């Protein structure tokens, strides 16, 4: 489906490409196969991201990466890519709003769930390769709000920083107040506890 | 990782150095040599600098800003505008012109910063190149007053004549390819 859409959206195929024209245009790779080149990259990138956030043609797992310095757009539909959900930031305002958490709060008898949040475009799944192209905010309220200017172009925001830890390290209370090797040792000891 | 900046040198210490000494490895990971100066050279920093220059390997590639291989049929023609003056001066009383002049020219520009840092001399470099390749290379060097240090190299005039009636159609590397090989060898192994 992605290849069909790309053909619709003015992507010249490699076979039809005059060799001279490649130099000034971005190369579009899908699952590691160089499909073609696109003369105007940013419009295509925005359109692909819109499609993914509406879940129309591009599934949520599909990851689009644009390397601006190297003039390459890589789209990966491959399996085994590791992804984490992140909130989406437009302008400097989080897309998640009070109406969404009100619907989630009454998750029972409203049939509003994480899938609805993903479909609404509030959250998105981002793999590491796409993480390299994403400006993230650790905490929304602190970093998004205007201050002494550090970054005014945040594109995603972390849901909560404690989710970096795994299953065994999550049972540690006050992990940030421990030495790192001790957290590592508790992760091993917790597997051997009795219960 | 947890040595100090006081050493100001790469030093292998700890278990890897213990293994190097124990196994008596032919090639240490960081071979090093501590040189103690005899007399006034130890007292004066400038004399120590002289000794440093004597002890540190320096090649033409370190002091060469850029190299260009030109084709100039006539030395008097001076295809490069800049070298017109000194080529004319040298050919006012030309040397080795009687044998011939090789048309292919190797032009080497030497960075003044590196040249003065190692305290090398244009005449010194010319002598070293002349000794290394004998008479097969003819070198023309600018005066130090010139803003750009230029060294002009041509194939041997006798070799250009071939000094042989038969002349041998082998034509190994012609002259341009031979000049490129000469440039690579000079840059890598000049040992100025």
């Amino acid at each position: 489906p992605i290849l069909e859409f790309l053909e619709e959206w003015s992507m010249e195929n490699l076979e039809e490409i005059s060799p001279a024209a490649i130099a000034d245009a971005t190369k579009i790779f899908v699952n590691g196969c160089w499909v073609g080149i696109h003369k105007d990259p940013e419009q295509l990138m925005n359109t692909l991201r819109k499609l993914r956030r509406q879940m129309d043609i591009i599934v949520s797992e599909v990851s689009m990466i644009r390397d601006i310095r190297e003039r390459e757009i890589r789209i990966y539909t491959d399996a085994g890519r590791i992804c984490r959900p992140l909130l989406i930031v437009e302008k400097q305002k989080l897309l998640l709003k009070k109406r969404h958490i009100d619907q989630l709060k009454e998750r029972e008898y409203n049939n509003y769930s994480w899938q609805d949040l993903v479909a609404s475009g509030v959250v998105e799944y981002i793999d590491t390769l796409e993480e390299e192209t994403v400006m993230l905010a650790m905490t929304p309220d602190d970093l998004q709000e205007k201050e002494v200017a550090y970054c005014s172009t945040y594109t995603h925001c972390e849901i909560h920083p404690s989710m970096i830890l795994g299953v065994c390290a999550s049972i540690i209370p006050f992990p940030d107040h421990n030495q790192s090797p001790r957290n590592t040792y508790q992760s091993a000891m917790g597997k051997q506890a009795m219960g | 990782f947890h040595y100090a900046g006081v050493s100001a040198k790469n030093v292998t210490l700890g278990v890897p150095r213990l293994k190097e000494l124990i196994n008596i490895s032919k090639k240490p990971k960081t071979p090093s040599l501590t040189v103690f100066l005899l007399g006034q050279s130890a007292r004066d920093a400038e004399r120590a600098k002289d000794i440093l220059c004597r002890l540190e390997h320096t090649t033409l590639r370190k002091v060469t800003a850029n190299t260009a291989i030109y084709y100039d049929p006539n030395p008097q023609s001076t295809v490069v505008a800049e070298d017109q003056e000194w080529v004319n001066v040298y050919y006012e009383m030309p040397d080795f012109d009687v044998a011939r002049i090789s048309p292919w020219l190797l032009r080497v520009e030497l960075d003044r910063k590196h040249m003065t840092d190692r305290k090398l001399t244009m005449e010194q470099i010319a002598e070293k190149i002349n000794a290394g390749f004998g008479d097969d290379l003819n070198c023309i060097f600018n005066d130090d007053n010139a803003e750009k240090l230029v060294l002009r190299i041509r194939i041997m005039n006798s070799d250009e004549n071939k000094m042989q009636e038969e002349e041998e159609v082998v034509d190994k590397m012609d002259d341009d390819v031979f000049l490129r090989c000469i440039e690579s060898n000079m840059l890598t192994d000049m040992t100025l």
């Binding site: 030495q179 | 947890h2 100090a4 900046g5």
Partner: peptide, 8 residues
């Protein structure tokens, strides 16, 4: 975890 000269 301390510094460059100390320990990690």
């Amino acid at each position: 975890i301390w510094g460059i000269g100390c320990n990690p």
